[PDB]
């Protein structure tokens, strides 16, 4: 386990880390001293012998150089001290141990590496100072701070070894994660706070600020955009100037609580063709998530275009925040005077509630709740009472927090903050918990020796009426010191079991490789899954998309989907198709509409059986919401002029398309039926969106635009297959182990111990239960 599974190796590194936005994402900062020390054997070629002989002439003392030279016989030549180090005639086939230079593949590491995206290749950018420089948006798949964290580095020694880093283990290749079927890297603290204040409509910038901001994009077409305001003084919006970073052909729609097409609160987001239309950019728009901006550009434009998109976004937003500034004082925690007067009034009303309940309990007038002791009902009542006052006063603070409150803005962009931190800092920190209970009596019938015995009031049981800003009392300080040690214990405890759990998961599933038939097997060859993931698709190229066959009334299902050819009121208007009047009552053609409708009804039965809860937003391998907007944009569509399609092109074309969405190429009946089983849900989406009414009325396609939609969907599906040879069990083990490490916090076994009991299958569970229907 310590010399064979893992071992110390040459060509290694270790330093401290630091974040530099002007470093690119796939770039890494390798200092010269470590770069002078590490080496890569490069055989001499006729192309590079002019460069290689020059590097020997520089010498190993100053970079770029070379530490050794190997001839044909293999007797090593030490260039640190040799009498013929000056004059060397490099014959072909000799080996040169040159220093590591710019734009070379190196493996960037971190401890602990319980994650596939914790071992990624990096481009070398040699830098003068001593730390390992890295981009800001690589903190997420490494879980790194810059407080004291160290990172390692390894160097390839062969050509195939160099290729596997650059083409498989690169940063852009691992942007989208199989775990969580979403990206990992995203825009972070200063960029995330800067992008919010920049994209506000009140925020405006003048020409002198624009031109510096404009040139800061590295690859940029050189055109200055026409300003939003031109008459009094030409002014550019933050939304105007940010659109230069986003490439042409990108579209994004997002809706939340208040989202009109006017958006008075400027919430929501609509992006069309790389120029954002309205909204305030924040964590939901750019933080690594399902259907994020990075999720779009990685799938549509590609990895490298999305990787450079991290650079251009940071350099613009940091430059605005450079010349605007942002801070945080203690006035960002001080609340209004009258707001504070309500807050302690709210606590006193809660404390009076605890007094009057206690007098009711003291007189044995309490009605015992079923299934619990009478004393347990007292704790359940009072704990829920005090948490109400804390949550009310905390939400009373966020009412009074003005828009310039620097703590609120970091939460408003979601950079580093939550609601509860505002409650503990300003209004009231609240109750402390020791092993799920209040502060117990270590002393005889009292919690602390400054209190009389048998005092169950919140002041004696661990309620901190004062807030962090207001000032903790000695009793409240000690009770907080009592509860805080449990969290430090639980953090040290949970990290111990988590690393054991990840070990047990990896060593159980290490042989799980998708063979060259999609039969998930192991060394003996025992089949676990006949199709990987029960469909055969890679988790990276997977997006959540609503299929609306499930939802809606049967009448609204009809009005959206019923094309009756032989009707006057349930037939498509001939303003929606060239052959509208010609195709009417066509008996050889109306059979195709009803046969289509018959499978759509059977599809609605099939999905409503499986998805009983009614949720339609589900992970599916090919996005069609984005693809139709591409066809709407690549080919310019007007709603006035009708299509140029026969209905028989549509229905026979979709029926032709399903036969070609291949997952398995056996000619046998069992594999072909399994192929029909594998694409059944995806075809259920495809028939719902490529319907005869929907194509010609909702997004009025043409014949040329429709054949491209068939061309894109087939290619995107075929690319979004699991590549055989992928180790997936080791990938599956880290996919559960990494979010388990973030697990730290009605009497049900939950969290990590519940996860421990499930894996280490328990004869005697701590909390078993029955859910009866």
């Amino acid at each position: 386990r310590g010399n064979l599974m893992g071992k110390r190796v040459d060509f290694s590194a270790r330093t401290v880390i630091s974040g530099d936005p002007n470093l690119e994402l796939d770039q890494v900062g390798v200092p010269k001293s470590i770069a002078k020390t590490l080496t890569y054997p490069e055989v001499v070629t006729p192309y590079n012998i002019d460069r290689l002989t020059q590097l020997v002439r520089n010498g190993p003392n100053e970079h770029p150089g070379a530490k050794y030279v190997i001839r044909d016989s293999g007797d090593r030549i030490d260039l640190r001290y040799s009498k013929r180090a000056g004059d060397i005639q490099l014959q072909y086939g000799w080996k040169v141990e040159r220093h590591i230079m710019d734009n070379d593949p190196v493996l960037f590491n971190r401890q602990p590496s319980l994650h596939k995206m914790s071992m990624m290749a990096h481009r070398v950018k040699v830098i003068p100072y001593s730390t390992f420089r890295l981009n800001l948006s690589v903190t997420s798949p490494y879980n790194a701070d810059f407080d004291g964290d160290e990172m390692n580095l390894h160097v390839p020694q062969s050509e195939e070894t160099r290729a596997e880093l650059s083409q498989l283990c690169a940063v852009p290749l691992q942007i989208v994660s199989p775990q969580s079927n979403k990206p990992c890297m995203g825009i972070v603290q200063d960029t995330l706070c800067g992008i919010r204040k920049l994209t506000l409509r009140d925020t405006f910038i003048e020409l002198d600020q624009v031109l510096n901001m404009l040139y800061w994009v590295p690859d940029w077409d050189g055109v200055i955009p026409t300003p939003a305001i031109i008459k009094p003084k030409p002014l550019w919006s933050g939304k105007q100037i940010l659109s230069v970073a986003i490439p042409n052909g990108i579209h994004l729609q997002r809706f939340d609580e208040g989202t009109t097409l006017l958006s008075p609160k400027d919430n929501g987001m609509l992006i069309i063709d790389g120029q954002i239309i309205f909204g305030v950019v924040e964590k939901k728009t750019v933080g690594s998530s399902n259907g994020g901006l990075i999720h779009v550009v990685t799938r549509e434009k590609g990895p490298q275009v999305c990787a450079k998109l991290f650079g251009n976004i940071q350099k613009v937003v940091n430059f605005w925040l450079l010349h605007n500034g942002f801070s945080t004082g203690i006035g960002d925690t001080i609340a209004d005077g009258p707001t504070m007067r309500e807050i302690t009034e709210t606590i006193a009303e809660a404390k009076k509630k605890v007094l009057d309940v206690t007098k009711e309990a003291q007189a044995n007038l309490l009605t015992a709740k079923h299934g619990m002791t009478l004393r347990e009902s007292f704790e359940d009542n009072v704990v829920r009472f005090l948490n109400e006052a804390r949550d009310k006063a905390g939400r009373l603070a966020e009412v009074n927090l003005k828009d310039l409150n620097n703590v609120k803005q970091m939460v408003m962009a979601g950079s580093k903050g939550s609601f509860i931190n505002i409650a503990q800092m300003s209004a009231c920190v609240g109750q402390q918990s020791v092993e799920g209970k209040r502060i117990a009596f270590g002393f005889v019938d009292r919690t602390l020796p400054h209190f009389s015995k048998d005092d169950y009031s919140p002041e004696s049981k661990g309620f901190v009426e004062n807030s962090y800003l207001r000032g903790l009392t000695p009793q409240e300080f000690f009770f907080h010191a009592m509860g805080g040690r449990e969290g430090l214990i639980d953090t040290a405890v949970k990290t111990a079991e988590t690393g054991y759990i990840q070990r047990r998961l990896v060593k159980a599933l290490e042989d799980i490789m998708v063979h060259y038939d999609n039969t998930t097997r192991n060394s003996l060859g025992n089949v676990i899954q006949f199709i990987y993931g029960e469909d055969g698709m890679d988790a990276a190229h997977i997006e959540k998309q609503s299929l609306d066959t499930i939802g809606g009334s049967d009448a609204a299902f009809e009005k959206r989907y019923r094309v009756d050819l032989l009707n006057t009121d349930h037939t498509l208007d001939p303003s929606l198709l060239e052959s509208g009047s010609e195709i009417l009552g066509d008996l050889k053609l109306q059979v195709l509409l009803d046969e289509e409708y018959k499978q759509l009804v059977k599809d609605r039965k099939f999905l409503r059986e499986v998805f009983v809860d009614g949720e339609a937003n589900w992970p599916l391998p090919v996005n069609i919401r984005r693809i139709i907007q591409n066809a709407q944009q690549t080919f310019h569509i007007d709603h006035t002029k009708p299509s140029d399609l026969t209905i028989k092109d549509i229905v026979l074309g979709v029926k032709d398309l399903q036969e070609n969405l291949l997952v398995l190429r056996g000619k046998n009946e069992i594999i072909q039926n399994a192929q029909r089983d594998a694409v059944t849900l995806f075809c259920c989406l495809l028939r719902s969106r490529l319907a005869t009414r929907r194509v010609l009325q909702e997004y009025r396609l043409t014949k040329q635009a429709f054949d491209w939609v068939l061309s894109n969907i087939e290619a995107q599906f075929l690319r979004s297959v699991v590549h055989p040879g992928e180790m997936v069990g080791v990938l599956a083990a880290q996919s559960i182990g990494e979010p388990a490490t973030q697990m730290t916090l009605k009497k049900v076994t939950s969290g990590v111990p519940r996860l421990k009991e499930i894996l280490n299958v328990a004869k005697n569970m701590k909390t078993p239960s029955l859910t009866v229907y």
């Binding site: 200055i224 300003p227 305001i229 919006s237 069309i272």
Partner: protein, 133 residues
């Protein structure tokens, strides 16, 4: 390449949406009845108080770089005191023989509904707005 729309409006509501330099204006069309608009306006440049009367126009001109005016040679095509540039992102259809258009002046949004603008306000990106005193 000339004027696409002209009307005179009386404002009804000015709404500072938790902002300092931007307000959401609400105005119907005088000389008509079934025509109103909702528009975002920078207040600091042009102060728009209540009960104002704003002559509003939309043109297609008067891509390529924006050079500064540099002279009277690049003569402005406006006796107004406000101008903006936007994109046509949505044309709503409220009912038959009625139409509403949506513009985005770089995040500042514009609502406009009416009847007779169904010969202009095409799907082209190019769109202006001009507001007189």
């Amino acid at each position: 390449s000339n004027t696409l729309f002209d009307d005179i409006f009386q404002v009804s509501e000015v709404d500072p949406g938790r902002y300092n330099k931007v307000c959401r204006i609400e105005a119907a069309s005088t000389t008509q009845d079934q025509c109103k608009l909702t528009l975002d306006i920078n207040v600091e440049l042009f102060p728009v108080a209540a009960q104002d009367s704003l002559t509003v126009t939309i043109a297609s001109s008067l891509t390529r770089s924006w050079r500064p005016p540099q002279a009277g040679d690049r003569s402005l095509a406006d006796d107004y005191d406000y101008v903006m540039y936007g994109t046509a992102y949505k044309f709503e259809e409220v009912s038959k023989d009625l139409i509403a258009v949506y513009y985005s002046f770089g995040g500042l949004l514009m609502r406009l509904e009416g009847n007779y603008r169904n010969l202009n306000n095409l799907k082209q990106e190019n769109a202006y707005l001009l507001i007189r005193r």
